[PDB]
Design a protein around this ligand. Structure first.
Ligand code: ADP
Length: 477
């Protein structure tokens, strides 16, 4: 099957957030499932520069009143379809922000044009290649299903994935007459959102199927706490809402080969793991012993529950454990953390900033990682931890609730548990989770078993991509 992906960004060409990571990894992974994907991305200056040997394969005479060439190029396993619309994308500034740091007043027309071109490509406008379906990503591309719906030619199936529910492509209804859409399209059934225009809302309304980055997150955005005002809409289409967990690069993240850790190991052979634990303590300048070593590797914010992690350090230390923290954020949280490091000198080590190699070493040498998030559409940290044999201790929120098998009586009895989850997401819940982890740690037969199992979890992109394929094939009937 041939799929047309649609996004305003893609790794490694352009990136402002995790959006590009998924859009850049899925297509490659999907090749393993027999799915050819061509990704339509804007001809950003940085895009045309990066790529090699581009081929003009089409020209749109009128794209909301603008000329555009369509270059097709293969870039590092990525089969791309670049949209060269100098009037929209030749700006020299972020893809969305001006040289001044703010949104282009043009944004609405810039991505509407990107969606419209995609809609036409989906309509068979390109001789030689026609998609069986389209997969749009986020608000920049959510208008693709809208233009297909209102186009004369019947729509082909569309899937819209929400990565960023907080960015809804909301604009004044005063741009409506410049969108090349029928008047009735400005309605409930269409793109009107409280007398304003909302692109995301439009696509949520028109797409054949909707998705996001975890089953649990798909449940959450149906509630007011996560829907960002869109829960009413999505809820009316819940019967076509899907949640699919993100994968990771399990070739790069493989403890058996990772070059950014002290010593390599595998589920089959863990002895070597302890050498990484030593190195982690040495690096953080803390005691090096056989006691539980917890880590945190995250942005220090209320969103990530690090407010709860600060009131929970004493509980760790009090239990005989250690804690090492790598991450940056809320200066009040940094401080309270830094302060914990002095009050519990030798037992708690904090490191503020960014450090990817250390991040690989911490996954390889710490015993457990605390991820007390209140918000986590999917999450990567717990997936790396499983892979690496670091037991995740996570809040039951979004992706975290979907990817860890909690060590409850039943799971331990069938030896199916891979980690510790807690809910609700409170300090009490957190201290409880922690205590449990330490109790588990002091039962080595149980602990190592949890590790070996977590380490055999398929957290690869291919696995994730296989779930998209099933859906694709299902949408394509
Ligand atoms: N302080 C840090 N140093 C190094 N890597 C980090 C740090 N904080 C997060 N990471 C890693 O960077 C990526 C982005 O995580 P952030 O935590 O930045 O993203 P998310 O939105 O997933 O929480 C993840 O792969 C995470 O493991």
């Amino acid at each position: 099957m041939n799929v047309l992906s649609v996004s305003s960004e893609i790794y490694p060409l352009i990136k402002t957030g995790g959006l590009a990571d998924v859009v850049g990894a899925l297509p490659i992974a999907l090749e393993a499932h027999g799915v050819r994907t061509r990704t339509l991305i804007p001809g950003y200056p940085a895009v045309k520069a990066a790529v090699t040997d581009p081929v003009k394969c089409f020209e749109f005479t009128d794209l909301l009143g603008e000329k555009a060439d369509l270059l097709e190029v293969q870039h590092e396993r990525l089969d791309l379809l670049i949209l060269d619309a100098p009037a929209y994308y030749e700006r020299s500034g972020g893809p969305y922000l001006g040289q001044t740091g703010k949104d282009y007043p043009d944004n609405w027309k810039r991505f509407a044009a990107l969606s419209l071109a995609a809609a036409r490509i989906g309509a068979g406008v390109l001789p030689g290649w026609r998609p069986d379906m389209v997969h749009a990503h986020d608000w920049q591309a959510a208008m693709t299903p809208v233009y297909m719906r209102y186009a004369e030619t019947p729509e082909i199936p569309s899937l819209l994935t929400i990565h960023n529910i907080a960015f809804q492509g909301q604009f004044g209804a005063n741009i409506f007459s410049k969108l090349a859409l029928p008047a009735h399209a400005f309605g409930m059934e269409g793109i009107e959102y409280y007398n304003d225009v909302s692109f995301l809302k439009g696509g949520l309304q028109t797409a054949t199927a909707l998705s996001t980055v975890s089953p649990s997150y798909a449940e959450e955005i149906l509630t007011a706490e996560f829907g960002m005002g869109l829960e009413g809409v999505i809820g009316s289409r819940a019967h076509v809402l899907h949640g699919i967990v993100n994968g990771i690069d399990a070739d790069v993240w493989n403890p058996a080969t990772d070059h950014l850790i002290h010593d390599n190991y595998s589920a089959a052979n863990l002895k070597n793991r302890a050498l990484n634990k030593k190195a982690v303590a040495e690096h953080f300048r803390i005691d090096d012993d056989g006691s539980p070593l917890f880590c945190v590797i995250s942005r220090l914010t209320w969103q990530k529950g690090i407010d709860l992690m600060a009131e929970a350090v004493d509980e760790i230390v009090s239990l005989g454990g250690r804690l090492v923290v790598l991450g940056a954020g809320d200066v009040a949280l940094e401080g309270a953390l830094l302060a914990a490091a002095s009050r519990h000198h030798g037992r708690v080590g904090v490191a503020i900033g960014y450090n990817e190699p250390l991040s690989h070493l911490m996954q390889a040498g710490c015993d457990a990682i605390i991820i007390p998030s209140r918000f986590e559409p999917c999450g990567l940290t717990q997936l790396y931890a499983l892979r690496y044999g670091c037991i995740p201790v996570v809040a039951r929120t979004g992706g975290l609730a979907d990817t860890v098998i909690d060590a409850n009586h039943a799971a331990l009895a069938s030896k199916a548990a891979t980690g510790v989850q807690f809910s609700p997401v409170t300090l009490d819940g957190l201290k409880q989770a922690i205590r449990r982890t330490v109790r588990y740690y002091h039962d080595p037969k149980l602990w190592t078993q949890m590790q070996k199992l977590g380490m055999k979890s398929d957290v690869s992109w291919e696995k994730s991509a296989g779930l998209y394929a099933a859906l694709y094939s299902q949408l394509i009937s």
